[PDB]
Amino acid sequence: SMVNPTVFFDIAVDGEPLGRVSFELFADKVPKTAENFRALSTGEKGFGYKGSCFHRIIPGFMCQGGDFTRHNGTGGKSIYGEKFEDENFILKHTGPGILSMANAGPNTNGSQFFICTAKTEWLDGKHVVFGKVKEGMNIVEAMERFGSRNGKTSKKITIADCGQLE
Amino acid sequence: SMTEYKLVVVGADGVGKSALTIQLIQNHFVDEYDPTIEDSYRKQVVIDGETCLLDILDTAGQEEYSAMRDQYMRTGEGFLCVFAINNTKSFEDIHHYREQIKRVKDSEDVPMVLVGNKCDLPSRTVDTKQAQDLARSYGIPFIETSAKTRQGVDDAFYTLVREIRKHKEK
Ligand SMILES: CCn1c(-c2cccnc2[C@H](C)OC)c2c3cc(ccc31)-c1cc(O)cc(c1)C[C@H](NC(=O)[C@H](C1CCCC1)N1CC[C@]3(CCN(C(=O)[C@@H](C)N)C3)C1=O)C(=O)N1CCC[C@H](N1)C(=O)OCC(C)(C)C2
Ligand SMILES: Nc1nc2c(ncn2[C@@H]2O[C@H](COP(=O)(O)OP(=O)(O)NP(=O)(O)O)[C@@H](O)[C@H]2O)c(=O)[nH]1
Ligand SMILES: [Cl-]
Ligand SMILES: [Mg+2]
C-alpha cells in the first residue's frame, strides 16, 4: 500500500516459531483504530502485543488475542487509554483474513482483536473492522487448527515478535 | 434405578454461572474470570433418596446468538436463572430469561430457580426481598448463593431438580 501501514506478528506455538502473519491496517478509512494497532505492534508507547496470547481460537470463526494487561482474555488497553469509542463501521466482516476489534459492547475497544477465518457478517456494525491479513493466511489457518469449539487452544499460541514493515 | 436431568445455567455475564457450576463439580472456587463460550458437565448425586445423573450446561452470558439460545432452552429441562446481588442490571435481566424460556418451550410452567449469587460480597444492590417478591410472582424458588464460600450451591442445583420432578408429576 502507498497509504496503509503494514505490521507483522511472528507467531509461536508453545514457544516454537510457526510463521509470520502480516496485516494491512486501513488507516485510510479507520485511522484511529488502525493507529492503535500499529503502535501496539511496534511497542513504541511502552506496551503492546509482543508476548501476548491468542487465547480464544474457534475453528470456522476466528482467532482472538491481544490481552497484554490481564493475560486471561478479560483485559487489554489502547494507546488512548483503557478504552476508546467505536470509530466507524465503514468496513464489514466479509471473509477470512479480516482484522477487527474485540469488545465488551459499544465503545469498549482496547487492544483485543480477532482475525476472521470465515465471513462473520453478524458482527457487522458491532465490531470495528480496521485491517486484513496481507501475507501469511496459511499461518492463520495453521493457528486455527489449535483451537476448539469453546475457544481453548491445545497448545499456547503467542505473538513471539511483532513490528512494522515497509 | 436412576434418572437424568438436563440443567441449564443462564444469566448475565459475570454473575457467577461458571463459578457455581465449578463448585458443584470440582468443589473449588475459581477466583479468576474465564469467560465462557459453552461447557457441559456431569455429576451423579442422590437427591431426596433418588439417584440422579445431572447434566449441567454452562452457557455464556450473551444475547447475540438466538438460534443457539433457543436450542439450549428446547433441550434443557430446568433453568438456573442467576443474577449477582451486586449487579442490578443482571437482576433486571431475569424476566427476559423467563419470557424466552416460556416461549421456546411453549409453556407457562417451566422448572426454574432464581439464584442470587455473590452473597458474600459487601456491595449489595439488589435486596433479598426484591428477589423473593419476583420469585413469588413466578411461583418459583429463590436461593441466595456464594460460589466463593459454597453457600447455597448444592441447594440451588438440587432445588432445580426438585422443581423438574414437580413439573414431571403434573
Ligand atoms: C452460543 C455459543 N457461542 C457462539 C456460537 C454461535 C453460533 C454457533 N456456534 C457458536 C459456538 C461455536 O458454539 C459453542 C459464539 C459465542 C461467543 C461468545 C459466547 C458464546 C458463543 C462470547 C463470549 C465472550 O466472553 C465474549 C464474546 C463472545 C465477544 C468477544 N468479547 C470479548 O472476549 C471481551 C473481551 C474483549 C475486549 C473486552 C474484553 N469480553 C470478555 C469478557 C466479556 C463477556 C461479556 N462481557 C460484558 O461485559 C458484557 C456483559 N457486556 C465481558 C467480554 O465482552 C469478542 O469481541 N469477540 C470477537 C468476535 C468473535 C467473538 N469474540 C467470539 O468469540 O465469537 C465466537 C463465535 C463462535 C463466533 C460465536
Ligand atoms: N465474591 C464472589 N465472586 C464470585 C462469585 N461467583 C463468581 N465470582 C467471581 O465473578 C467473576 C465471574 O464469575 P464467572 O463464574 O466466570 O461468571 P459467568 O456468569 O460464568 N460469566 P460468563 O457469562 O462470561 O461465562 C469471577 O472473577 C468469579 O471469581 C461469588 O459467589 N462471590
Ligand atoms: Cl460475539
Ligand atoms: Mg461462565
Side-chain angles (χ1 to χ4, degrees):
Chain A
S1 177
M2 299 290 273
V3 56
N4 286 335
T6 302
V7 297
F8 71 91
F9 290 170
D10 290 321
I11 304 295
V13 178
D14 278 350
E16 293 303 319
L18 180 64
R20 174 166 291 191
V21 183
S22 71
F23 306 95
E24 172 177 355
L25 307 183
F26 300 144
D28 54 357
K29 293 179 179 65
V30 205
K32 193 180 175 194
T33 308
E35 169 63 14
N36 180 60
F37 194 90
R38 189 201 64 75
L40 295 174
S41 295
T42 67
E44 65 193 63
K45 310 295 188 180
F47 48 85
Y49 289 133
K50 193 181 307 194
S52 66
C53 175
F54 280 85
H55 65 279
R56 178 185 290 176
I57 301 183
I58 303 182
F61 297 96
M62 84 295 154
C63 301
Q64 180 175 336
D67 178 2
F68 56 81
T69 71
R70 304 277 84 88
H71 312 274
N72 64 8
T74 69
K77 66 179 184 174
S78 82
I79 67 170
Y80 310 116
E82 288 180 9
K83 292 171 182 54
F84 66 108
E85 61 187 22
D86 295 315
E87 182 174 11
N88 66 61
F89 300 113
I90 295 172
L91 298 171
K92 292 164 180 28
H93 302 82
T94 48
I98 287 293
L99 178 63
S100 180
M101 292 302 287
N103 65 47
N107 307 309
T108 56
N109 301 287
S111 58
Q112 285 195 51
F113 62 90
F114 60 108
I115 307 171
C116 299
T117 57
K119 184 182 212 72
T120 62
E121 71 283 352
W122 62 91
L123 302 177
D124 291 349
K126 304 303 193 78
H127 295 259
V128 175
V129 172
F130 64 96
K132 67 180 170 177
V133 172
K134 180 178 185 172
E135 293 187 345
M137 194 65 206
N138 65 308
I139 302 303
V140 176
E141 295 169 351
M143 292 164 61
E144 182 185 28
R145 296 190 283 267
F146 292 100
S148 66
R149 185 169 174 272
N150 76 357
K152 294 286 177 179
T153 63
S154 56
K155 305 206 167 180
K156 194 177 178 181
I157 309 304
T158 58
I159 298 171
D161 209 342
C162 50
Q164 182 167 2
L165 299 178
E166 298 188 298
Chain B
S1 191
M2 82 179 77
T3 310
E4 184 169 345
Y5 301 99
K6 292 177 257 273
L7 311 187
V8 181
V9 185
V10 303
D13 64 79
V15 298
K17 298 183 296 297
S18 299
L20 286 169
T21 302
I22 290 302
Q23 272 287 15
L24 182 81
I25 300 298
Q26 304 174 18
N27 263 272
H28 74 88
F29 171 59
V30 284
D31 199 5
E32 200 162 352
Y33 182 19
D34 183 4
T36 302
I37 293 291
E38 188 200 285
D39 295 286
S40 296
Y41 303 90
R42 302 195 104 186
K43 185 177 178 56
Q44 192 176 39
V45 299
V46 182
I47 300 170
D48 301 350
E50 296 171 0
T51 302
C52 301
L53 187 57
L54 306 185
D55 308 325
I56 315 285
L57 179 63
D58 184 17
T59 70
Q62 59 79 29
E63 304 154 317
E64 307 320 304
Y65 301 104
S66 64
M68 283 293 298
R69 176 203 66 192
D70 294 344
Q71 188 59 65
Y72 291 161
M73 295 178 173
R74 268 195 297 279
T75 295
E77 292 175 284
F79 300 84
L80 206 76
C81 295
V82 186
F83 71 98
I85 62 137
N86 65 344
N87 181 344
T88 296
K89 176 65 160 55
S90 75
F91 177 74
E92 296 173 343
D93 284 351
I94 289 293
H95 70 96
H96 286 144
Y97 291 102
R98 180 170 169 87
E99 292 153 8
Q100 292 154 9
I101 296 163
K102 289 168 62 182
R103 179 191 62 71
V104 169
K105 305 189 72 66
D106 181 41
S107 179
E108 279 199 295
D109 173 52
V110 180
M112 55 186 76
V113 171
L114 181 64
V115 173
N117 190 46
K118 311 197 185 182
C119 71
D120 57 287
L121 288 181
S123 48
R124 174 184 294 268
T125 65
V126 182
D127 289 337
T128 303
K129 181 168 182 302
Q130 298 184 241
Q132 283 171 349
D133 289 348
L134 185 66
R136 188 188 320 110
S137 75
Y138 294 158
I140 69 176
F142 166 59
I143 314 285
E144 286 212 341
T145 62
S146 168
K148 183 179 171 85
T149 70
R150 220 174 182 279
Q151 172 186 336
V153 173
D154 285 341
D155 183 20
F157 285 95
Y158 289 9
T159 296
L160 183 55
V161 170
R162 288 200 196 86
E163 293 297 300
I164 294 167
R165 292 172 171 169
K166 288 163 52 174
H167 169 79
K168 290 168 80 185
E169 178 180 9
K170 294 171 183 171

